[PDB]
Amino acid sequence: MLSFCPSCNNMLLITSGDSGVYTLACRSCPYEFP
């Protein structure tokens, strides 16, 4: 879905955040976004 992560170009992943919030963050790169 054109989910490019900057400085790694890998992927994005919808992460179950704190208190079940839907933050998006990939593995294998320390990057996050609301």
Binding site: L13, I14, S16, G20, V21, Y22, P34
Partner: protein
């Protein structure tokens, strides 16, 4: 109609090639309802009635949203409510979701959510392409209906499909005059005496249009040697 037409009637094979079924209408005119039964019998796929499917989040919501083209229902002249679509999503055993979480939002906007490692992204991504290929109305078996005209003004209804039992029970078509092909479903539906008379009328059909003529009697002996 040739050598690969004789081969499967003698074999009585299960998966036949092109089983067309012939069902006649009630009336003769067009009336803006002669093709209204074609909507009630063909595989009405929801990707033709949807236009714009997208995922949206506010801050804590994981729900896919679909919308329909309300101005298209009257064009191909099918008739259905909005709630029966919301029935049809949970009428799909391929998608393993909960039975009733469907909530209507107005007249044309409809949403369904998902909630439970890493289930949440994958279960909304498998869900994204497995939605626009579910049947909503019509037969779940047949493929393509075609209306044509013969040397009379009467119009029939072709269906290139397998099932016959649900073709007869629907409205707009009379169940008295519904011939077909593919012998060994007629044995399931119309007793046994119909299955004998069918293999008579099929063999001399595909010998009628090859030029030669065998006999009506040399198949009447073949007709009951199998049944």
């Amino acid at each position: 109609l040739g050598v690969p037409r004789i081969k499967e009637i003698i074999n009585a094979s299960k998966v036949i090639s092109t089983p067309i079924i012939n069902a006649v209408l009630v009336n003769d005119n067009d009336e803006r309802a002669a093709r209204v039964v074609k909507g009630r019998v063909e595989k009405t796929l929801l990707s033709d009635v949807a236009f714009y499917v997208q995922d949206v989040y506010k801050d804590n919501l994981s729900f896919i949203q679909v919308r329909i083209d309300l101005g298209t229902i009257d064009k191909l002249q099918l008739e259905l409510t909005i709630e029966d679509i919301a029935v049809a999503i949970t009428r799909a055993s391929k998608l393993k979701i909960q039975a009733s979480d469907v909530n209507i939002i107005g007249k044309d906007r409809i949403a369904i959510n998902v909630f439970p490692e890493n289930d949440v992204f994958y279960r909304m991504q498998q869900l994204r392409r497995a939605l626009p290929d579910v049947v909503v109305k019509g037969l779940p078996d047949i493929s393509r209906a075609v209306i044509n005209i013969r040397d009379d003004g009467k119009r029939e209804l072709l269906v290139e499909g397998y099932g016959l039992r649900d073709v007869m029970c629907t409205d707009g078509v009379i169940g008295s005059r519904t011939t077909t092909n593919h012998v060994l479903e007629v044995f399931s539906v119309l007793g046994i005496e119909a299955a004998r008379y069918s293999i008579i009328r099929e063999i001399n059909y595909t010998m009628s249009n090859h030029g030669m003529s065998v006999d009506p009697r040399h198949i009447q002996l073949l007709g009951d040697v199998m049944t």
